[PDB]
């Protein structure tokens, strides 16, 4: 449940996390910029090339599609029914199928599939600390607004390190309360809402204790501030990082010409 | 009489054997104590008593109820009434407004009448030694040694029968530890089993009647502590500790004092020393 990294050897694993994260944001941006059918063919080709390059079995992608498949089909069907034009095919009182509606449903399912595939390739093919460092680096432009990014990086790091510990603490607290006789799912709305205080209040107080202890520790080891501190973990650009950008640029060129424009 | 038949829990690439073939029949009314090295699955076996977990393939006979791998979560509010678990840091489960309401939050879940629940909570705060005027203070406003006592009076007020305790006196002062152990040793006297899980071995030697030794998720020895601490070689081979009195007696036997009997407790060791010098 915690973490989704899957080790391997393919070259996508060697792409620097900042370059990969920028490529994913850029792919999400360039999804918007595709309307014509050949443009969606280009999106499909590039997404499937990236997926076949990451060298993963289809079951992890299916695991990434299963939670939100119902919303995918519901939205695709709503788009097909809402927009009508051309051949009418099967008809009803208001449910009017159409060739334009069918192709629009397909062209929204394509957007769903590509967004899911690219996001899953990000989450699966890079370590959580690597993504944390990538985001702490991407937050650099905020230095121009005089806001402090050292505080944000520290808060992200502490929260990321304490998510699993607090999850174990939470499940232990629920186990103790269930052993006392609590029922966390049955009894109506009022009972189901009253039975969340025992889940939270001991967790909140344990969080207060952990916060005080960790603040004392960091203050005792010499945390004067986030300015004037080197770093232990660093991200260094490689030659393989030229592979995304050259890819990431090429896609753009096609959408300059391939779409209706 | 608690009975376990081929009980075995498993955690996928991370399939871990958290527990293996267990074959034991705990009797009723005996201060059973669980021992084993760190990571020996004492807590996993402990959580099978109130069916918080469920055996992967086996059978549990607990307090007259039967637990099987397919048994659902419905109908357990009449088992967890007869089997109460006090986790390691029980003081980290207090949440209510006042100590009395926190203590009676236990019985209120098991169909106790409000007046009956309040009277039971008052009785069991009086028994655990909590102060009379400390009843209505906020549970978060007390010390550690008082939070622990409130928590212990919380998972024990509705008079369970197969109570299991994961180190109830981990961080108490020696007077408090002695008081809690006497409370439990007196609680079983009324006819309730007090299964205990302690890495400490002096109080197990002093109080416990049955000892369950767990090695790497499997029961290895189950007998009285008089017949478990007989040879130090086995205990040192299976990572188990030894009570201080037994270790001192073994060390003294090197000088050749030929101590009669088998001392386990400090008064017993002192009496054995006195009887030997004659």
């Amino acid at each position: 449940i915690i973490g989704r990294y899957l080790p391997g050897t393919t070259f996508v694993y060697r792409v620097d996390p900042r370059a990969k994260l920028l490529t994913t944001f850029y792919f999400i941006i360039m999804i918007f910029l595709a309307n014509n059918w050949v443009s969606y063919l280009v999106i499909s080709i590039f997404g499937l090339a990236y997926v076949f390059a990451t060298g993963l079995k289809a079951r992890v992608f299916w695991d990434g599609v299963k939670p939100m498949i119902w919303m995918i089909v519901f939205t695709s069907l709503l788009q097909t029914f809402f927009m009508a034009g051309g051949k009418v095919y099967w008809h009803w009182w208001i449910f009017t199928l159409s060739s334009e509606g069918l192709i629009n449903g397909l062209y929204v399912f394509i957007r769903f599939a590509m967004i899911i595939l690219v996001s899953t390739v990000m989450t699966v093919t890079t370590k959580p600390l690597e993504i944390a460092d990538a985001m702490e680096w991407m937050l650099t432009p905020l230095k121009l607004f005089k806001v402090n990014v050292g505080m944000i990086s520290l808060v992200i790091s502490i929260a990321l390190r304490f998510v699993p510990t607090l999850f174990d603490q939470t499940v232990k607290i629920m186990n103790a309360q269930r052993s006392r006789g609590a029922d966390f799912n049955d009894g109506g709305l009022v009972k189901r809402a009253k039975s969340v205080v025992p889940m939270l209040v001991p967790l909140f107080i344990d969080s207060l204790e952990v916060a005080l202890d960790l603040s004392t520790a960091m203050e005792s080891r010499g945390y004067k501030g986030s300015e004037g501190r080197t770093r232990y973990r660093i991200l260094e650009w490689s030659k393989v990082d030229l592979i995304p950008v050259a890819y990431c640029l090429l896609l753009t060129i096609l959408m300059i010409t391939t779409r209706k424009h | 009489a608690i009975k376990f038949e081929n009980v075995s829990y498993v955690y996928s690439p991370l399939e871990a054997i958290g527990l293996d073939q267990l074959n034991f029949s705990l009797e009723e009314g005996k201060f059973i104590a669980l021992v084993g090295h760190t990571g020996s699955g004492k807590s996993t076996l402990m959580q099978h008593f109130n069916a918080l977990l469920k055996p992967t393939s086996g059978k549990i006979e607990i307090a007259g109820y039967t637990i099987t791998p397919e048994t659902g979560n419905k109908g357990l509010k009449d088992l967890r009434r007869k089997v109460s678990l006090a986790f390691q840091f029980s003081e980290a489960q207090l949440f209510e407004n006042t100590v009395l309401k926190d203590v009676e939050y236990g019985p209120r879940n098991f169909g106790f009448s409000e007046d009956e629940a309040r009277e039971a909570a008052l009785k069991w705060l009086k028994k655990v030694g909590l102060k009379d005027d400390l009843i209505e203070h906020s549970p978060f406003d007390l010390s550690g040694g008082q939070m622990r006592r409130v928590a212990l009076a919380g998972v024990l007020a509705y008079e369970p029968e197969i109570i299991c305790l994961d180190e109830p006196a981990a961080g108490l002062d020696p007077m408090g530890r002695l008081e809690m152990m006497q409370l439990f040793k007196d609680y079983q006297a009324a006819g309730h089993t007090v299964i205990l899980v302690t890495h400490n071995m002096d109080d197990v030697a002093d109080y416990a009647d049955d000892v369950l030794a767990l090695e790497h998720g499997r029961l290895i020895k189950h007998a009285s502590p008089k017949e478990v601490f007989k040879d130090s070689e086995w205990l040192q081979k299976h990572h188990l500790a030894e009570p201080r009195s037994a270790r001192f007696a073994a060390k003294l036997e090197a000088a050749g004092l030929k101590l009669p009997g088998q001392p386990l407790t400090m008064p017993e060791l002192a009496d054995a020393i006195k009887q030997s010098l004659k």
């Binding site: 600390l129 944390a132 790091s157 502490i158 990321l160 390190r161 699993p164 510990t165 174990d168 204790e209 952990v210 202890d213 960790l214 004392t216 520790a217 960091m218 203050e219 005792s220 080891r221 010499g222 945390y223 004067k224 004037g228 501190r229 080197t230 770093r231 232990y232 973990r233 660093i234 | 090295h37 760190t38 990571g39 010390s143 550690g144 040694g145 961080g171 108490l172 002062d173 020696p174 007077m175 890495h199 400490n200 990572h239 500790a241 201080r244 001192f248 060390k251 003294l252 000088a255 050749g256 004092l257 400090m266 008064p267 060791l269 002192a270 009496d271 020393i273 006195k274 030997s276 010098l277």
Partner: protein
């Protein structure tokens, strides 16, 4: 040679009615294991926080906290905190870094040590505590013993001159307690530090070079551990578990066997009982 000196103190917390530490005066010789023992909530962690300048006395005019010949003041805490390192009670609360060998680099990061030096200092510090095989391992995959070992490595990376074990081994399996005490004593012998261990346990303090007893924020008695424990009445009245040897001697005295107060530790008792039986 008094490495650490505390004169009259008042550390009234803020708000509470009674002071947390009344007039407290003690000294710590350099290189000597000095152990503080006190009742639960007698004001030991407050002394620990006072030593490394994290807190401060309220009456700054006639209160002195000298560390390594450097007085404690408003413009000196960031220097004294460099040469004193504290290991706190909770093994996992103080683990700040994302992973081992990244936590051990926190003390060096806070002092802007260049990375080429850090990459060797953290490796050596992890090697000292024997956690070499577990570098870059997540905190949730470690027990209490390993987390305390990595915290010791972390406070040793900055190369301190005082290690204050604020009840470091009060949450572990006795095997872990023995292992960590052996590790700390080995590090102290190798690097020539001064260790102050704060423990409610008495067996751990039975080997200390000096013992300081705190009662209600005051220094009750002070001395060597072979002349502090034998006055069992004080240790019983303040709520401290007497060591095994002295409890057994008290039991024998109750039964009718009188032994000298010089008889400390176990093998001395064994030998004395042997000669008594041989008669």
């Amino acid at each position: 040679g008094s490495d650490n000196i505390i004169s009259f103190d008042h550390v009234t917390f803020t708000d509470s009615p009674r002071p947390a530490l009344s007039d407290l005066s003690f000294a710590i010789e350099r290189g000597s294991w000095t152990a503080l023992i006190g009742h639960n909530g007698s004001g030991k962690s407050t002394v620990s926080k006072l030593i490394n300048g994290l807190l401060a006395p309220d009456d700054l005019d006639k209160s002195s906290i000298t560390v390594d010949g450097v007085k404690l003041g408003a413009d000196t805490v960031w220097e004294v905190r460099e040469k004193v390192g504290i290991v706190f009670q909770n093994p996992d609360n103080q683990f700040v870094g994302a992973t081992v060998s990244d936590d051990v680099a926190f003390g060096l990061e806070n002092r802007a040590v260049p990375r080429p030096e850090m990459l060797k200092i953290v490796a050596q510090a992890v090697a000292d505590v024997g956690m070499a095989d577990y570098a870059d391992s997540e905190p949730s995959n470690l027990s209490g013993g390993q987390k305390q070992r990595v915290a010791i490595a972390g406070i040793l990376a900055v190369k301190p001159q005082v290690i204050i074990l604020d009840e470091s081994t009060s949450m572990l399996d006795p095997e872990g307690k023995e292992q960590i005490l052996d590790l700390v004593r080995k590090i102290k012998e190798d690097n020539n530090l001064t260790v102050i261990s704060i423990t409610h346990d008495l067996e751990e303090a039975a080997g200390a070079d000096q013992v300081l007893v705190l009662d209600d924020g005051q220094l009750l008695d002070q001395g060597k551990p072979e002349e502090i424990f034998p006055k069992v009445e004080m240790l019983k009245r303040i709520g401290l578990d007497i060591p095994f040897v002295y409890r057994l001697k008290q039991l024998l005295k109750e039964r009718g066997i009188v032994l000298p107060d010089e008889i400390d530790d176990d093998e001395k008792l064994v030998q004395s009982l042997w000669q008594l039986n041989s008669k």
